[PDB]
């Protein structure tokens, strides 16, 4: 599978007029993305960017960001995504810790007049053993070094196991600072499919309209996004464009496949997850319908070119199951942590009877049915209106409290992003069909009440 | 390189104690000092930047908020107005002698209609010439009806679809000719079609521009699609069943340089000429059509990537007529 | 009992050092003190008497002079605007990329036309579907041409004239039906005909209102007549030869109570539907027709004794096609 950018070039020659990536009103075809990524890649080389370098890119929800990413890979260098909403001190840490030379934003192709550079093919630079991207997690944060050979193995097997082709349309919900997006960008391109970018990932109502309006066929998020979105969905809703749901990240709730099957009766929902420390994904397990219901959803078998182990204290396989630590190996393994030898030596180790392995830190057991089950990881006043009381009651059930001041900031009870959507989702269900966001921009309980009620349905 | 905005002809105004009345809304804040000079300035065509330099005097964030709202509320516009905005001031000129319940009550409307269908001009004299009905009318004219339910299984054959759309093509014969009339022979109506999946043999879903010179469809947009929420409630089942959607678009650049504003008027007439012409070829080919007065044209206009000099005038839903079932595909 | 006048939507304004700018004219005298409050007052509908009481303050002769001129110059109007006034503000919104010589030079126009007939939408993709011309079109559609010279000797037979006008009549069949479409089935276009002497068998010269419910002509005016100076120079020979003139008139009372301003828009579309429908029945009966965009409708409107809620949208000249001579009578 060579490199990530080579899979795009080969497919861009097959279907040059196919849409490559769409945001809102202007979008790039495969020939357009190839022409503008070549022009910027030559611009990077004029600044001395070559093999072994690392380039910072800002993960804004614009088609220019796709060009910069592809242009960095074409220059032979790896890219490090930077969240534009992160504070300056955290953005600065990653840029200096990763030893990046420059940072690319959306102000480049027009600002530097790069439309004048050459738009033709560039004799390759990167090899499959080269680093494609370094992404930082657990913000202090640690970077993960993923190679081109590794990132291509995960992407190639998803598309071939699920027959991703030109007719597919992938909704780009995950932020590019999260490794999941790599399939939304590169896995989509390697099959000739179209990527639809999302302006706001926490606007659940817009996510629903986007799937219906643009005929989205592939959904690839953390299961929390699908469960929160289907709580902004009426009881009589039904969509037949979505044909594949890839869920990974955090636990996988049991009531969620029931929601997915009832609203997308044609979607093949797949329960997976493969640790960012490896190629993004590593485990493959389709919901094989449901003939079994207990208390947990099993992880699955290795995706491809990867292995799984339940190991004890001497790094030996636990017999006929035996809950233990979870290890992975194969072609998906990362090179290591960037500029941290202590974490790399502890996490990436050598197996006495097999190739290198990585310690996920998760706990689990091999079921006698052939699948591994996930068993956890780390061991050790009064309202002034009826509408204010209803809104407080929703804050009470989501945040588990009693009575609150209307001026208590929504996170005075520990409220976060996921619980912010949970609050507005329940407000949406009962008939307050307005702004389901705007929970942190408006601290006052009443200010949210004036924003969520009125108008609503029609 | 900057966008130039004009005061909308559809918006009339007044100054007030409350604030600046524009249309049906009263505005407050910076906009009160900018006015009325802002009105005078805006008919001439001004950019956002020039407006800020002239009126900002303070927070450019405070100046941008009022400018953003006048563009949003369509008081400041970037190009020609759609028909609905053109005609909106006429409501203040028509004295309505009937009750509003005609629009809300099927019983009040059924009576208003029967009165309007037996109306006569008031200045009629007491002389009469009874003519003759003895004539015969072509069935394609006399049997045309508005079809609001279509065969959703049998695809429109590629031959049928080609024949229907050949009514709009060019004919080279010492001079370019069409099969329908056009003020000044300028033919400024762009014709677009949205085709639903599997409903027209040979045509993938998507928005196409019909080029009458080649007799070809040229794709504009296969990503987006028309949905039922883009249609008025009373029309959503018409659209649901239909195989394709026709959109009649006025190209001001093909008309106004010669006839001025009357070319926009002529294109509205020409839209009807096209609509009626279409509905007859359709009857010849056992295709049904139904004209659609209103729909979310703001979205369709965006899907078709129309320019500032193009506005959608009319829409038509079409498909094969019911007569026999088929295998479900 | 007093007449109520409204500020015309087609007129936009500005205050000046010179005086009161309204449209393309600057006004002087009393009107400078009355303004701008007069503008605000006038959109609401005011009489001449009420205006005098409020603004006269002096010579009622001096007050009447400015009121007489604002009504004459169409700044103050008594009813719905004709199409040409409706669309007039659009000139300030259309940026023309061509030179004015298209309108003054047959050579500049012939080039502008050929460019507009080979135009395409700019947002077209590089995909194509070549359809099929193999089809057959009805001769009544494909052979219709604009006829600008008519047989001035052979009278239109009473049967032929009756058949042509039967395209517009009603049909009772559990519900009133026409042979052509109409937004909401309200059919708000009044149809009038002017017949020249001796040119239509059975019909004396004069203006008639066609009643579609009876299928009858009802005289409106036999005293006045249409002349060549009522027509644009380029059309005077069309009218000279023609046997009759059709006038399409919008009856706001048959439409606007239901659809508001959009009903005026719909009637403009319906006028084209009628025009096109007519031109096909005519081809079936070897009658020629030619649509007329502009003419002195201010006079024709007066001859027909139209009310405030009626405006003329379109005119058509018609007659028998040339093929053989006859005895001069
Ligand atoms: P607010 O504004 O902050 O709200 C928005 C937020 C940020 C809350 C929300 O929109 C959001 O999370 N948006 C980001 C998109 C997204 O999906 N981000 C998640 C990263 S995807 C990546 C995570 S990971 O799997 O690598 N984490 C590794 C680690 O997770 C555990 N794990 C994951 N799936 C598991 C399953 N199914 N079962 C057990 N454990 C699972 C493992 O321990 C694994 O090692 C994924 N896509 C790549 S694998
Ligand atoms: C501009 C226009 C818009 C129309 N819109 C609708 C519509 O939205 N829904 C509908 O059911 N019929 C619609 N019609 C159909 C006619 O209003 C009417 O039902 C019929 O066409 C009158 O003659 P017919 O019944 O023989 O077709 C429309 C017609 C016109 C001319
Ligand atoms: C609204 C309208 C007004 C027209 N006015 C005139 C006119 O004043 N004089 C004229 O010679 N032709 C006039 N025509 C004829 C057409 O502009 C054009 O000459 C011809 O109809 C195009 O197709 P045809 O030549 O097959 O009829 C008019 C057509 C339309 C639609």
Numbering used by the authors:
A (entry chain A): 1297 to 1435, 1439 to 1679, 1784 to 1861
B (entry chain B), C (entry chain B): 2 to 330
What is the paper's account of this structure, in its own sentences?
The bacillamide biosynthetic pathway is a common, three-protein system, with a decarboxylase that prepares an NRPS substrate, an NRPS, and an oxidase. The oxidase is shown to perform dehydrogenation of the thiazoline in the peptide intermediate while it is covalently attached to the NRPS, as the penultimate step in bacillamide D synthesis. The oxidase forms a stable complex with the NRPS and dimerizes it. We visualized co-complexes of the oxidase bound to the elongation module of the NRPS using X-ray crystallography and cryo-EM.
BmdBM2–BmdC complex is a very elongated dimeric structure in which the two BmdB modules are kept far apart, and in which the active sites accessed by PCP2 form a catalytic arc. The center of the complex is BmdC in the same dimeric configuration described above. The area of the BmdC Ox domain most distal from the dimeric interface (residues 223–231 and 303–306) makes a small interface with one end of the A domain (residues 1321–1323, 1468, 1512–1513), burying 491 Å2 of surface area per protein. This positions the two BmdBM2 modules in a plane perpendicular to the BmdC rotational axis, stretching out at ~45° to the core BmdC dimer interface. The configuration is extremely oblong, with the BmdBM2:BmdC complex having overall dimensions of 65 Å by 65 Å by 280 Å and placing the Cy2 domains on either side of the massive complex. Surprisingly, A2sub is disordered, despite no visible impediment to its binding in its classic thiolation position, suggesting A2sub may not be required to help position PCP2 for aminoacylation. In the catalytic cycle of module 2, PCP2 must visit A2 for thiolation/aminoacylation to ligate the cysteine substrate (forming Cys-S-PCP2), then the Cy2 domain for condensation and heterocyclization (forming AlaCysthiazoline-S-PCP2) and the BmdC Ox domain for oxidation (forming AlaCysthiazole-S-PCP2).
